[PDB]
């Protein structure tokens, strides 16, 4: 059943993967309202689709800036993977298009805000709260990894909370479809596996490492390896001496010792049993895995929901007007977008 869900899912992903959707909207179909977040090449805005009156989250990327930083391949990956996937806890792409100056990805709007904001505000989540989120990630990485996708950027910043209090993963900008091995140093310092830092070649197991970081940070209030500068973070990660807060249950600590594990013959998620090594862990024993997938578990936290168009769960950012040039920029580099 788990095996034939993943086989249908792979067949659906692969037809979209080999023939991506292109040019399914235009900028003038949307009213731009407010910036929900930023990145290297631009921003994500709340928009309103004028024809239906539906709200969406539109990513706008400046093509010239992508080229200046040598990240063309990353942004093609983001859109090609997003358009192809389908899972309850992945933010859904509704449309995508490009013009002379920019690339656009219109996603569902997830109004509860970033896990990061609620975590920093609250301080830390209880084990049951953290577990509820962790399960959704476990099931998401099961799906993505079955498609030969590595995510490579798990962190509370990239986990949105939706109106029922469930997770939607965003930010596929570092995601990559790979059988075998890959080498780029990428991700967030605090979330990186040792093998990434040491330029060893790595695979999907880095995402399971990242999950250990996230669980640790959700439950502690702070990450297992931190310092003011990235180079000192790396140094703490390669030593691999994790200190656990005294309030951590003995089961949590044991799970964490198996995810934050430098040795890839011992790291959960990677091994022969696979993801079952995680699902059947004792920390997860109260977890009804099928009920998480079906969204029948009641979330420990529903964010305030102030009607559509409301952004009170997001921080404020400086707005900047979209400029569209009359000449086509970087047409050939972005032709498949």
């Amino acid at each position: 059943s788990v095996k034939e869900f993943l086989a249908k899912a792979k067949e659906d992903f692969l037809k979209k993967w080999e023939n991506p959707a292109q040019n399914t909207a235009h900028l003038d179909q949307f009213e731009r309202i407010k910036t929900l977040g930023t990145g290297s090449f631009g921003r994500v805005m709340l928009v309103k689709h004028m024809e239906t009156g539906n709200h969406y989250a539109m990513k706008i990327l400046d093509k010239q800036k992508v080229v200046k930083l040598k990240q063309i391949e990353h942004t093609l990956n983001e859109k090609r993977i997003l358009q192809a996937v389908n899972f309850p806890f992945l933010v859904k792409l509704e449309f995508s298009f490009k013009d002379n100056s920019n690339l656009y990805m219109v996603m569902e709007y997830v109004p509860g805000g970033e896990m990061f904001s609620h975590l920093r505000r609250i301080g830390r989540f209880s084990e049951p709260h953290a577990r509820f989120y962790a399960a959704q990630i476990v099931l998401t990485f099961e799906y993505l990894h079955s498609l030969d996708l590595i995510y490579r950027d798990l962190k509370p910043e990239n986990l949105l909370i939706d109106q029922q209090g469930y997770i939607q993963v965003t930010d596929f900008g570092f995601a990559k479809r790979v059988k075998g091995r890959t080498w780029t140093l990428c991700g967030t310092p605090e979330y990186l596996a040792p093998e990434i830092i040491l330029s060893k070649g790595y695979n999907k197991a880095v995402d399971w490492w990242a999950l250990g970081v996230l669980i640790y940070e959700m439950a502690a209030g702070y990450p297992p390896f931190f310092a003011d500068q990235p180079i000192q973070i790396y140094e703490k990660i390669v030593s691999g001496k994790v200190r656990f807060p005294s309030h951590f249950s003995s089961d949590l600590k044991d799970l964490l010792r198996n995810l934050l594990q430098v040795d890839l013959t011992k790291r959960f998620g990677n091994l022969k049993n696979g993801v079952n090594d995680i699902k059947n862990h004792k920390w997860f024993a109260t977890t009804d895995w099928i009920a998480i997938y079906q969204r029948k578990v009641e979330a420990p936290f529903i964010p305030k929901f102030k009607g559509p168009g409301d952004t009170s769960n997001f921080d404020d950012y400086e707005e900047e007007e979209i400029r569209v040039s009359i000449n086509e920029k970087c047409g050939k580099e972005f032709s498949e977008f």
Binding site: S40, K70, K155, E157, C186, T188, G221
Partner: peptide
């Protein structure tokens, strides 16, 4: 404490990924 050191650190805001 570890919590105090984290809260006094320069890394409690949004983290950027590296390339």
């Amino acid at each position: 404490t570890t919590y105090a050191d984290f809260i006094a650190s320069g890394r409690t805001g949004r983290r950027n990924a590296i390339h």
